[PDB]
């Protein structure tokens, strides 16, 4: 009866830290003194860890609103989810949701046609899009820059494996040239790619603007390359026959309308 929530590490929506020696999460507060709500989330390094952030505050609100109990865990393979040929199969959180390993996905999960065919997405809890992250000084126009459209081993760019971005470039035939170049450099996680950009190991990282804008605001040695493309949103994910789907969406709408969503933004992003 307790809902199994699956999530993924992705700051500032989901932070993941080790518990304390006694197995609990360290008590922390925001800049002005509000308690940072944390939940114990199990996952591979399987051990108990601490989770918190935008998406965690949203889960707590949804759970209290619809009155349900839950247990949270980090996606076993560390991926968002794509469908690959083997018959086809889903990996990441998509696979876990579809197999019953999870009853709901609460993360910065991009709503797209490919996934909507198999699961139910709530109305967006966040509207954003894709942008490009580079090291301060790197001169790139946008997704139309020649260094991207006419690739070479001189300027490497990539995205995260088994992600909505991977699906996007693999779907659009007009992006075929970029797709082939990225297929040889994509990273296992956003954190790693970002670190690679700082270490001049990666020249450009194509990812979610909600995440990249945040990173660029915390690390002044990194910047985003103008012009947002592939505008998209994040939604809660559930199986199509979930009895919580209607109330989950109504709750998201309510939160946008009464300012709750804006408060999370002031708390975790715009700071």
């Amino acid at each position: 009866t307790r809902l199994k929530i699956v999530t993924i590490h992705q700051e500032p929506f989901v932070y993941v830290k080790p518990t304390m020696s006694d197995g609990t999460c360290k008590e922390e507060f925001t800049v002005n003194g509000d308690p940072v709500k944390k939940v114990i989330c199990t996952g591979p390094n399987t051990v108990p860890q601490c989770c918190y952030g935008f998406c965690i505050d949203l889960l707590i609100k949804l759970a209290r609103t619809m009155n349900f109990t839950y247990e949270v865990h980090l996606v076993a393979d560390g991926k968002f989810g794509t469908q690959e040929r083997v018959k086809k199969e889903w990996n990441g959180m998509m696979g876990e949701l579809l197999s019953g390993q999870a009853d709901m996905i609460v993360a910065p999960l991009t709503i797209n046609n490919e996934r909507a065919q198999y699961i139910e997405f709530s109305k967006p809890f966040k509207y954003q899009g894709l942008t490009i992250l580079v090291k301060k000084g790197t001169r790139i126009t946008g997704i139309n820059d020649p260094r991207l459209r006419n690739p070479s081993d001189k300027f490497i760019y990539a995205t995260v494996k088994q992600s909505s971005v991977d699906i996007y470039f693999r779907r659009q035939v007009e992006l075929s040239t970029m797709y082939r170049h990225m297929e040889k450099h994509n990273y296992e996680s956003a954190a790693e790619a970002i670190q690679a950009v700082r270490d001049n190991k990666l020249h450009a990282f194509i990812w979610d603007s909600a995440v990249l804008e945040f990173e660029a605001s915390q690390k002044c040695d990194l910047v985003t390359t103008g012009e947002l493309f592939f505008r998209s949103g994040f939604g809660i994910g559930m199986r199509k026959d979930s009895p919580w789907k209607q109330n989950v969406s109504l709750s998201i709408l309510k939160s946008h309308e009464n300012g709750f969503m804006e408060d999370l933004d002031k708390t975790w992003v715009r700071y």
Binding site: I111, N112, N113, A116, Q117, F121, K123, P124, Y127, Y168, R171, Q172, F230, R231, S232, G233, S249, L250, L253, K254, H256, E257, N258, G259, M261, E262
Partner: protein, 276 residues
């Protein structure tokens, strides 16, 4: 497969034009859309006038009709506008769907909680919400600005309003009781009247649908009117369908399909982007 669909005029999403007297057929990028017009005010007698419709949402309907494979009979709502619940009864486009006179409503229809309780909405296909329009340089944070929250705290009070009966007024009514009660004095009959009041200095700010305000700012003569910042209560326009409708599934997949393929951006540059 032949569906009754309701819409409402609101440039650039839905624009209405008179049909050619000698031909009685819609040409160019327009599609047929009828409107029930009363004969007089002493009777219920009326007649459907054949007109033509075009715009961002009409292009969306055309794409959907083709990909999802359905035909339609498009008509313009005459009992209210977008949708308001009066004495527990929905009017406007929402009402037409609720009481089953239309299978769906297509247009600049904002998705919000109370409406989603009586109709089903497709995924959002145009991002919107609540924005504020003012003359360039005007200093206002946003809706939470004290000039809006506590109007009478300033000598000459700030003068601002919206077009009543839509999702925007509903939101302000629920979130800011004082602001709402104060605003009624400045209700504008429509967007056009509002812009005129702004340009002539009869109003200081106009609070309304973000997508329409951005479109208007993009074509303002002299680029004097701009939107502040920002979008409060981000949401989007959505196609409204009857609860449990069998059309929702394919409609959603198609819309998401269009977004991913860039078809939405083309329509955006074609209908929404302006000189400013």
């Amino acid at each position: 497969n032949h569906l009754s669909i309701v819409t409402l005029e609101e440039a650039p999403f839905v624009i209405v034009e008179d049909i050619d007297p000698l031909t009685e057929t819609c040409v160019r990028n327009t599609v047929p859309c009828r409107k029930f017009v009363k004969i007089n005010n002493s009777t219920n007698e009326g007649m459907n006038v054949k007109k033509c419709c075009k715009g961002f949402c009409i292009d969306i309907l055309k794409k959907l009709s083709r990909t999802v494979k359905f035909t339609y009979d498009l008509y313009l709502v005459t009992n209210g506008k977008h949708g308001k619940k009066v004495n527990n009864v929905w009017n406007g486009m929402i009402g037409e769907v609720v009481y089953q006179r239309a299978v769906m409503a297509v247009g600049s229809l904002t998705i919000n909680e109370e409406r989603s309780e009586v109709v089903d909405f497709s995924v959002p296909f145009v991002e919107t919400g609540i924005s504020v329009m003012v003359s360039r340089g005007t200093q206002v944070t946003g809706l939470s600005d004290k000039k809006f929250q506590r109007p009478h705290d300033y000598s000459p009070p700030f003068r601002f309003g919206t077009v009543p009966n839509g999702s925007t007024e509903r939101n302000i009514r629920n979130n800011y009781p004082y602001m709402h009660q104060y605003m009624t004095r400045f209700n504008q009959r429509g967007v056009e009247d509002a812009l005129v009041s702004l340009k002539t200095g009869k109003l200081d700010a106009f609070i309304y649908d973000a997508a329409v305000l951005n479109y208007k700012a993009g074509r303002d003569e002299g680029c004097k009117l701009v939107t502040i910042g920002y979008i409060f209560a981000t949401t989007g326009y959505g196609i409204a369908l009857q609860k449990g409708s069998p059309w929702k599934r394919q409609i959603d997949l198609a819309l998401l399909q269009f977004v991913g393929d860039g078809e939405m951006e083309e329509l955006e540059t074609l209908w929404l982007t302006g000189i400013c």
